[PDB]
Amino acid sequence: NTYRIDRLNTSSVKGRTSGVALEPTPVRNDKMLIVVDTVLYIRNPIDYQDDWTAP
Amino acid sequence: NTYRIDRLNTSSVKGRTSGVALEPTPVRNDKMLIVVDTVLYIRNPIDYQDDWTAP
Amino acid sequence: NTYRIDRLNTSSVKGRTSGVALEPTPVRNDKMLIVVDTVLYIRNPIDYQDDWTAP
Amino acid sequence: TDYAGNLTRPHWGGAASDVDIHLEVYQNEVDTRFQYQAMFLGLSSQRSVADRS
């Protein structure tokens, strides 16, 4: 009854000239849940006798 | 729903001397009954929503 | 980091005789999770020069 | 509770369908006793005196 969409972040951009070491960065993520809870409905009873004598 | 099995008894040996009457003895009987009158059952209703949201 | 196994219960046999209504019963359930945490390791480095000079 | 008090009970014949009149399913079996066989026929000495004394 649940569906999951996984979020995720972005990362910046750097600049390295000639021998400068490269610096890593992390990215963060989360989750999302959509939970189905209730039902929609509509019920229409028609008697046999009324059904017999009507289109 | 019933079932019948008959039962039967036994006679007893008795002694006699010269002019003595042979006493007649009855052999009793009866019947036995087995009657089915109870319905064992299991009743497990699963709702539609739980069916639609679970294997 | 996870692994799921579902569980289930039993039902209770009940008795009806001639015209009584059957009484439904539910069946409870649960689950269990197994989680992987750590990684085992063995790391033996060998220098080039020692490998070049020993079997 | 109950389902319906108006049933067409087959072999319950009364003003309220209460007294049982089902036909007793009978197979021709009757149990009487467990038989016994004498063994002292050969554990003695038979000496008939019939019609003599």
TrEMBL record, chains A, B, C:
Q: What is this protein called?
A: Putative capsid protein
Q: Which organism is it from?
A: Shigella phage Buco
